[PDB]
Design a protein around this ligand. Structure first.
Ligand SMILES: COc1ccc2cc3[n+](cc2c1OC)CCc1cc2c(cc1-3)OCO2
Ligand SMILES: COc1ccc2cc3[n+](cc2c1OC)CCc1cc2c(cc1-3)OCO2
Lengths: 184, 184
């Protein structure tokens, strides 16, 4: 049961300090010895990769469970998914900060990236139809993700601070993201 | 001197933490007692607002010296301002970090903001022409700044980590920002 405590602790630490977060802090907060952290995860980077797959799985599971097959318009379907990402981040502030920091950390392996894209094949294919070509490229994909996550985190933040207008920020946010990242 | 020094530390501290940077840590990092801090600054708040004009000055002062003055195309001029914001951010990481948190802090007085519109009358009139009218409203102005900043900061992160492509990043950042916030 310690693995899960380590994951949850590293989720909290990274959400607060990014990938600079200390393994000693993560281990202690999970109620285990740093030496024990390292027996579950031979390297810090190994912890980073597993954590990312774990969080990505969670987020994906949540978007799949809200996915309405009746929606048939492509942009409308992209909006309902943005909404899900957003309410997911609203329900789990730490998980989203962590995921945002992990996703753009350059410490994710090729196989990790692959194994993550192949979790929700149809959601992956959807996004990829609308996304600007350069944001699909091996050189700039990582940056397109970065742009998407900065936009969703700001939307999350404004929604959380002033909930009376949450749905307005989420909607304005989606419309900003859609013009920024998608093709004509 | 301890007045400016109490602003250096302030910048660092807010760069590390956030608007909640301990007014107590800011003190020793000036070589003074905490009560000395509150002597220069009525409250924590006034310190926030005062530092914000301070960092805004330095940013805008860097941003004014690069102004060509004779450019017509609104997008083109925005592009130089954006280019300037990023350089200043890459050159002064701590400062950008503090200005960034203060801008969305919600603690800046309206008076403080009107002081900012008075520092760079070339941007206020520029936004008054290109920016979606929703993001100029009073309810959504701060959101629209929050989205510009997130997008600028992401472009900066990627530019700093990958200098070989800093120019592509900056260029992709500006165009995503411009589609997100401006008229069609
Ligand atoms: C959790 O990480 C995520 C999660 C969600 C993501 C969703 C998107 N991107 C990265 C992902 C990001 O990458 C890390 C990149 C570009 C993009 C364009 C889009 C879109 C969604 C996305 O909808 C319409 O156009
Ligand atoms: C803090 O200082 C800065 C730095 C520069 C800024 C430039 C802009 N904004 C905030 C400022 C930010 O603070 C809000 C907000 C919105 C905006 C829309 C735009 C734009 C520029 C800006 O060009 C086209 O559409």
């Amino acid at each position: 049961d310690k693995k899960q405590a380590l994951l949850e602790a590293a989720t909290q630490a990274i959400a607060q300090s990014g990938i600079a977060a200390s393994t000693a802090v993560i281990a202690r907060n999970a109620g285990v010895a740093e030496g024990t952290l390292f027996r579950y995860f031979a390297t810090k980077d190994e912890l980073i990769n597993t954590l990312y797959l774990h969080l990505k799985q969670d987020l994906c599971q949540s978007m799949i469970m809200e996915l309405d097959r009746s929606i048939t318009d492509a942009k409308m379907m992209t909006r309902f998914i943005w909404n899900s990402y957003i309410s997911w981040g609203l329900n789990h502030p730490a998980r989203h900060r962590a995921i945002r920091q992990l996703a753009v950390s350059e410490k994710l392996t090729k196989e990790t990236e692959q194994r993550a894209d192949d979790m929700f094949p149809e959601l992956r294919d959807l996004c990829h139809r609308s996304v600007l070509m350069v944001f699909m490229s091996d050189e700039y994909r990582a940056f397109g993700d970065g742009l998407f996550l900065a936009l969703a985190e700001t939307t999350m933040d404004f929604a959380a601070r002033d909930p009376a207008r949450a749905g307005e920020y989420i909607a304005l946010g989606f419309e900003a993201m859609w013009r920024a990242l998608t093709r004509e």
